[PDB]
């Protein structure tokens, strides 16, 4: 409703770096808000793509940002009559970034890894990896829970069980308020998908450089399965957290699995031991239900509600024809111990191939009426196909079914304006929460400041 679309702020990265592929707000120890931006095709030392991270201080004028520096050198360790290798070429550092406390977590889902033992090998595969930084102190750490030193032949002899070689850890990421990092790994267990969790504090305290294979004893991984419903389901394509079991001492995980059960799609809610509390099934095959999940109480009852994006949902139209436009599903959490039911609201795109629902950002209470609000991206939407971000306001019965405000992309065609979103943080300290929108195809980020209601 009251985002300012006239005076925007633009930050920009190098050409071709995909600056803006991911982003988040970041508060330093003093509460000063900055913006962390991931740029997953930034050039490394060897003039080869590795990805990179930028930490943009807040300025109404925007501009360029300093690097948040990470080690971009391939590593090798000869230990235990084996040879451990990391490969950072085309790893996509910055394909996800998330901030918690005064720490930044930036991940390289396609960092590759191999282990050599005489003539055998584990196989060079994308286990992914996450890099952790405390900018003010300079402290650094890594977390790569899917690395292993098992040789190829063993996986074959055991029929590929507990195969974490293609995890792509960091594909998605989130941190609990208590500071537990949770990583989506859509390729885990031969492309079923897994989740890896561990306290940030324990990640830092157990990390040392050059080890490459080390234990984080407080970590917790989800489980392989024999159920074909999960095969190639990419469990962990997206992740979030929230309170869904009525016990405030537990944190619940939300996991998107957009190809679950032969591309039907699904979203599951779990406890922190990965036991399944609910499952939301997709409505239409290949719609990629679960591509994005968002958690926020929109109807002001203090109970978190769940939003799910299916950006490829095909809407039914005249003469038995279908139109890919994307769809968003609202699930309101019922009072006390009860299942999430049918959706309370369906939001459906209008522009062909717009991918409405590709990203869903909680905004907090944008217009300050007592109900939290959301922003939905259609990165190829709008009458020109350049991208659109649509704002829907919360209300006692859930969400308004029509947008209160629409943001047309200020960038050229192909920018993917809205592919990444983040709201609910007041960057300029004016008492209203603001919205940052990434347009990685244009290598830029746009900041929309919220203003008093007209």
């Amino acid at each position, epitope marked *: 409703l009251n985002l300012d679309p006239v005076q925007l702020t633009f930050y920009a990265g190098p050409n071709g770096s995909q600056f803006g592929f991911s982003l988040d707000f970041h508060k330093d120890s003093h509460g000063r808000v900055a913006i962390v931006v991931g740029a997953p095709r930034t050039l490394g030392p060897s003039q080869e793509e590795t990805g990179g991270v930028f930490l943009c201080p807040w300025r109404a004028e925007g501009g360029q940002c300093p690097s948040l520096l990470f080690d971009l050198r391939d590593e090798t360790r000869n*230990v*235990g009559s084996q040879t451990l290798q990391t490969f950072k070429a085309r790893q996509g550092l910055g394909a996800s970034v998330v901030s918690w406390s005064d720490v930044i977590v930036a991940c390289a889902p396609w960092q590759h890894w191999n282990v050599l033992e005489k003539t055998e090998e584990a196989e060079k595969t994308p286990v992914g990896s996450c890099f952790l930084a405390q900018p003010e102190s300079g402290r650094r750490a890594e977390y790569s829970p899917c690395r292993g030193n098992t040789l190829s032949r063993i996986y074959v002899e055991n029929d590929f069980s507990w195969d974490k070689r293609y995890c792509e850890a960091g594909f998605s990421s989130v941190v609990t308020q208590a500071g537990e990092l949770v990583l989506g790994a859509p390729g885990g267990y031969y492309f079923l998908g897994l989740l890896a969790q561990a306290p940030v504090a324990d990640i830092f305290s157990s990390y*040392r450089p050059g080890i490459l294979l*080390w234990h*984080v004893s407080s970590q917790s991984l989800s489980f392989d399965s024999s159920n074909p419903e999960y095969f190639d389901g990419y469990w962990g394509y997206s992740v979030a957290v929230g309170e869904f079991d009525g016990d405030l001492n537990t944190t619940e995980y939300v996991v998107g699995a957009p190809t679950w059960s032969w591309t039907l799609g699904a979203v599951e809610i779990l406890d922190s031991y990965y036991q399944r509390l609910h499952r939301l099934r997709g409505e239409q095959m290949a719609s990629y239900f679960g591509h994005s999940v968002a958690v926020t109480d929109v109807n002001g009852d203090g109970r978190h509600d769940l939003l799910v994006g299916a950006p490829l949902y095909m809407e039914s139209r005249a003469d038995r024809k279908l139109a890919e436009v994307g769809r968003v599903y609202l699930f309101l959490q019922p009072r006390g111990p009860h299942a999430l039911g049918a959706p309370s609201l369906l939001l459906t795109g209008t522009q062909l191939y717009g991918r409405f629902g590709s990203a869903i950002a909680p905004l907090g209470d944008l217009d300050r009426d007592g109900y939290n609000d959301i922003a939905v991206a259609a990165p190829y939407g709008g009458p020109s196909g350049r991208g659109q971000v649509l704002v829907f306001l919360g209300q006692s019965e859930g969400l308004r079914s029509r947008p209160s405000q629409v943001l047309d992309s200020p960038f050229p065609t192909g920018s993917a304006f809205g592919f990444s979103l983040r709201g609910a943080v007041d960057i300029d300290d004016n008492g209203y929460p603001d919205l940052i929108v990434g347009a990685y195809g244009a290598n830029q980020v746009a900041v929309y400041r919220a203003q008093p209601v007209v």
Partner: antibody
Amino acid sequence: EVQLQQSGAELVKPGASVKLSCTASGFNIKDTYVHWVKQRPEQGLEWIGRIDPANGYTKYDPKFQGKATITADTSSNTAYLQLSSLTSEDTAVYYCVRPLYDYYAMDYWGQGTSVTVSS
Amino acid sequence: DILMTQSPSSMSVSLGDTVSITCHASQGISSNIGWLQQKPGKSFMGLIYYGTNLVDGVPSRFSGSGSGADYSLTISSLDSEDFADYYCVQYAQLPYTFGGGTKLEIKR
């Protein structure tokens, strides 16, 4: 807290066999490698082998191939060292070991089990 | 197998001294070395891993250094508890192998 609690001293005859135990206290035996090390005053310390209790795969120093057999039961969170066709030279102290952080290190040690082979 | 030649076999020193044990390997081990303490008539406590990294709970008067095939354990300002046995161990290759040991004894 990580603790490795080993079985009590054994007192056996030559040619017989014995099976020592290493029970994980405060953690899951499945988390890391578990090693066995033999100690004697003259000969000092000698590495026997390791097991990955998650899958049962083992390694041994060729010196102990035949006598040493390492196993693990994740159910009882315990790792075992079986010694066969015992001999005076098998008279030694035996420790189980696991790393702290480094997959390949040797940081936590049990209290050790005394073995004495005699007729 | 890799041979770990640890020196000196023993040393007589006094509280407050700064002393240094060394360990030489038969080939490069690229810091894949650990250091161990065994107090009289007791089991083992880890001190160092990967050449320089303190095991959790170990005082900082202990330090590890070295590279290639030559490494050192150092104890600044000896404490009464520090008079014990010390062993290096390499895990660059299987089978893991140990040093002969070093005993810190009281000088008088």
